[PDB]
Design a binder for this molecule. Structure first.
Ligand SMILES: CC(=O)N[C@@H]1[C@@H](O)[C@H](O[C@@H]2O[C@H](CO)[C@@H](O)[C@H](O)[C@H]2NC(C)=O)[C@@H](CO)O[C@H]1O
Ligand SMILES: CC(=O)N[C@@H]1[C@@H](O)[C@H](O[C@@H]2O[C@H](CO)[C@@H](O)[C@H](O)[C@H]2NC(C)=O)[C@@H](CO)O[C@H]1O
Length: 150
């Protein structure tokens, strides 16, 4: 498992630390890279969007709020939204939780993006349509393009 050429150095460190926290041997870091690419384009695709303030993994305010105590338990410090490493840790925690609970990567991605109760036509906290199925397909492909085994 090596860094994909297109993934910026700073991002790779973030996702690799997150991977170490879950004991995933570099593979989760590949999945998180794909997630971050889609969500924020490594931080270059944030401006212009109403969800810009939501950071690298685009975790929505009410979702961040829901997982605050769990984040602190997992990582030993309070979630700091100004920290990019924390943004990645928070996104990783939520994504891991969906994958473990729903039983697969594809489904974890789908429900990461749409919530547990996503249906076609459902909108986000900004009123934008959530295309959770398409999100999952393209992010799963990218994870595989990066060399993801599972
Ligand atoms: C066609 C395509 O891949 N377009 C990308 C946009 O989807 C993308 O926006 C992000 O999309 C996610 C759903 O796929 C949203 O959860 C997320 O909020 C949204 N990010 C922002 C900042 O609005 C943009 C930005 O990364 O990149 C396009 O390539
Ligand atoms: C990564 C991210 O932030 N995804 C968002 C989903 O969490 C989110 O779903 C809603 O999350 C709330 C807090 O966890 C829940 O109270 C609520 O049940 C849940 N809604 C559904 C339909 O599952 C969605 C929609 O708000 O936005 C995503 O971007």
């Amino acid at each position: 498992v090596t860094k994909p050429a297109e993934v910026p150095s700073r991002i790779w460190t973030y996702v690799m630390n997150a991977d170490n926290a879950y004991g995933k041997g570099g593979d989760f870091a590949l999945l998180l890279s794909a997630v971050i690419k889609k969500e924020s384009y490594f931080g270059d695709g944030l401006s212009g969007s109403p969800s810009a303030g939501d950071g690298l993994m685009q975790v929505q305010p009410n979702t961040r709020n829901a997982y605050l105590s769990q984040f602190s338990a997992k990582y030993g410090h309070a979630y700091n939204h100004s920290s990019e490493q924390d943004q990645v840790y928070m996104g990783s925690l939520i994504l891991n939780e969906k994958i473990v609970r729903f039983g697969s990567i594809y489904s974890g991605l789908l429900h990461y993006n749409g919530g547990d109760y996503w249906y076609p036509g459902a909108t986000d906290s900004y009123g934008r349509p959530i295309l959770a199925d398409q999100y999952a397909n393209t992010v799963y492909a990218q994870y595989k393009s990066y060399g993801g085994r599972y």
